């Protein structure tokens, strides 16, 4: 999930105001990568052996 | 320019009546209703009666029902109240006033009000007693001359010194009503001490309903 | 006959400042409630009427609202001439009641008063009654009290006070204060007493004589 | 942003931006605990294999 | 108008079904009072309504400060209420030289009494006597009771906050239906097949505009999706069945060497055209800018996606 | 509700709600972990089983 177009997309305004609340949302953006990183490590454990 | 002139005040003994009138000037009665107000010396105010004009229609406070009756005249453009079965309980001072419907709605404008008294000591001129300084030091060095005027009925009275050449450093009290039936009130002069044995301190009283006045001389006294 | 509450009892501000007063109704009385303000000397004048509406001959200073039950009067920025008693006037239900009324002081510079004793005379204990006198003169604040002594007790229930007007451009006052004995009791005391209490006194003014004395 | 006076909008866009971002929170913080569940089980797989 | 209805009772105009420019009424600028509540007076044609209604009456000049969300007071509570969520703008002018009479304009009445408080947009015309007393009134005047309705003081003599007003609010209604009060915004044809932004009688969106392989019956405008936005429209003026897909997007991930081997790299747009983003690749998992391609497999080095991996060779 | 003015009823109400909602959302994620947490030592107690 992309936080910026999420809230609102392709408008000067809306990410001026996403930006409010600084690197919050960045972070889930990054948890949310971090969890289909994961995702392919367990399949990778379960075949590549 | 809106005007509202009362008149018709006066002393009037217990069991008799009195006719209060006001005149009004700058609008008209009809659409409106028009009211008396009492305020009796020392008392904050009470309403007695309301009549709306263009009606006939009337109310009274229910403590001067069957002796307080009002009126109105459209064609004079003036309004009286009838005050009848007078007791030493309702002298005030009586004003007139105007509003809007029978109720529900604020007086706008008040007349000045007309002042009756009424006492078991029908009337009295004024006498006067001296009050000593003190003999010892004060603060600022400062010291005055008093004297209480006592006795006398109705109020106003005009308090002053000097015979009526000094107003300077004079402070006065409003009078109040003793249970002689009659009136009295303190008054004193302020001023470098040294200037009690120089200047004149006669206690000047005028008392208008009486037609008299006393002058009340006032001086230090051995202490 | 809806009775009204007006409050505070006194304010006190200085001159420039914004002055609320406020008035409370026991019942409903639409927007018939009226704004007085009574100068010493004066007959009460009309500030508003009707709740809203300013009377004519009335500076713009004078406004007020409702919230709920509660109606504020308000003075934007007192005046020098704005010291006065104010009332409020419900005119709905007759007969018409008012409210006590309230005061606004000038919040002067507070002093103690020049204190005088006057011992019955001679020629007052004539009357086979004797009358002590202490004056206060020329003070402020508006609220101040003398509490007597009779041979260094305290005094009660043997005395009587009267209080004037504050002054028009000090604000200051005078008050009296007595003590009523016979002859016979003023005979059976030795010494009296005047204690001067109030806000700009630091330490109890103290006045005194013997019996007989001046 | 097209509908209020810009700082109408920011106060009425800050209510937004924050519930929408509190829904995401919550979406993420679930997600994680059931990735870690599928974790376990990937790695059970992994051991059975 | 010529003629204001007394606020006791608010005259309601109900508008549907034409084009509206508020920009005029804001620009002209003949109102003292011009204040928007939910809505901004900003020339905000864009958005369009389900219908508006324009409410219009005479008051006082310090009454005008009641009408408004959120307010109580003589008329707020008993002649004319707004809604506490309103959306909607509050216009007024003074009228000394139209609504003044000569001994006062008495046609113009407001409610003084009523047993309750009246809801957003309720009207009452009722003049029966309202009993303030205990007693009953039984439809005679007097002390107590009052007759409801009362006339304004419209004195031409009078200061401002005593002067006559008149009032239009303007009320905004926005339902899930097709907005038939719509600004005069430049009409346009509509493009297909390509990336537009859309305004359909005021809704929004950007996408790329295509034949609907859909039919939609007779009774609506549009349909929806998952997420409560448009799927697909009507054109309001020729009623064609147009489905509206996002344009194309997608994340932007870079394939790096260490930058300690070399500083070639190509940029990845996930899902889109590589004409849309001389060494450019085409594949499924998206367009690579600043590589080529080989049709053989090897051992994977930096995985681009769907069984595709990047890596260096001369 | 009962006691004060309808919209600054509402206004604290509102604020009420979301704060008693936060509690609610606390307990939740908390139980949600622990939840993870029992399961694994409860894992643990069926393999030793
Ligand atoms: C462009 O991308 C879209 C969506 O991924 C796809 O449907 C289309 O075939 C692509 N066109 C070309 C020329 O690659």
Known sequence: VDCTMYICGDSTECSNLLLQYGSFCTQLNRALTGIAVEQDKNTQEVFAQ | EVQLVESGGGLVQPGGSLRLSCAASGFDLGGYSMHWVRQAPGKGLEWVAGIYASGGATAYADSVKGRFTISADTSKNTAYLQMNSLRAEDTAVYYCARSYYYGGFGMDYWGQGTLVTVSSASTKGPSVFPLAPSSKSTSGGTAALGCLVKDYFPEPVTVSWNSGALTSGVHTFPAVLQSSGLYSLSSVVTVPSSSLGTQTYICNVNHKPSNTKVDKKVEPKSC | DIQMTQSPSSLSASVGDRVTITCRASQSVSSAVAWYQQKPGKAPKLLIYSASDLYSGVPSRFSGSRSGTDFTLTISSLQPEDFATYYCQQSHTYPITFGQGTKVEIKRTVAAPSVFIFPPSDEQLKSGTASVVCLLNNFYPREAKVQWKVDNALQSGNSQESVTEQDSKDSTYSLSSTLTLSKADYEKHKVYACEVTHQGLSSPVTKSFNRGEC | ?49 | ?314
């Open chain 5, 1 to 314: 108008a010529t003629r204001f209805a007394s606020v006791y009772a608010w005259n309601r105009k109900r508008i549907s079904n034409c084009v509206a420019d508020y920009s005029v009424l804001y620009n002209s600028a003949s109102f003292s009072t011009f204040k928007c509540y939910g809505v901004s007076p900003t020339k905000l044609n864009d958005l369009c309504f389900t219908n508006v209604y324009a409410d219009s009456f005479v008051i006082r000049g310090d009454e005008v400060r009641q009408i408004a969300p959120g307010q109580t007071g003589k008329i707020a509570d008993y002649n004319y209420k707004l809604p506490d969520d309103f959306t909607g703008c509050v216009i007024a002018w003074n009228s000394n030289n139209l609504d003044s009479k000569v001994g006062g304009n008495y046609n113009y009445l407001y409610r003084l009494f009523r047993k309750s408080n009246l809801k957003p947009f309720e009207r009452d015309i009722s003049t029966e006597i309202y009993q303030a007393g205990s007693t009953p009134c039984n439809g005679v005047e007097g002390f107590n009771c009052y007759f409801p309705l009362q006339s304004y003081g419209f004195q031409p003599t009078n200061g401002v906050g005593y002067q006559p007003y008149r009032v239009v609010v303007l009320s905004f209604e926005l339902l899930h239906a097709p907005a038939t009060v719509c600004g005069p915004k430049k009409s346009t044809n509509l493009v297909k097949n390509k990336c537009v932004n859309f305004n359909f009688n005021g809704l929004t969106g950007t996408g790329v505009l295509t034949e609907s392989n859909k039919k939609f019956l007779p009774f609506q405008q549009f349909g929806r999706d998952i997420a409560d936005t448009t799927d697909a429209v009507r054109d309001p003026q020729t009623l064609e069945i147009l489905d509206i897909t996002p344009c194309s997007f997608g994340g932007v991930s870079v394939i790096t060497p260490g930058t300690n081997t070399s500083n070639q790299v190509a940029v990845l747009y996930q899902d889109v055209n590589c004409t849309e983003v001389s060494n450019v690749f085409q594949t499924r998992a998206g367009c690579l800018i600043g590589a080529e391609h080989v049709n053989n497999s090897y051992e994977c080095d930096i995985p681009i996606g769907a069984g595709i991996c990047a890596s260096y060779q001369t």
């Open chain 4, 1 to 49: 942003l097209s509908r209020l006076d810009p700082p109408e909008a920011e106060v009425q866009i800050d209510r937004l931006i924050t519930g929408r971002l509190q829904s995401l929170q919550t979406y993420v913080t679930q997600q994680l605990i059931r990735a870690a569940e599928i974790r376990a089980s990937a790695n059970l797989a992994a051991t059975k294999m």
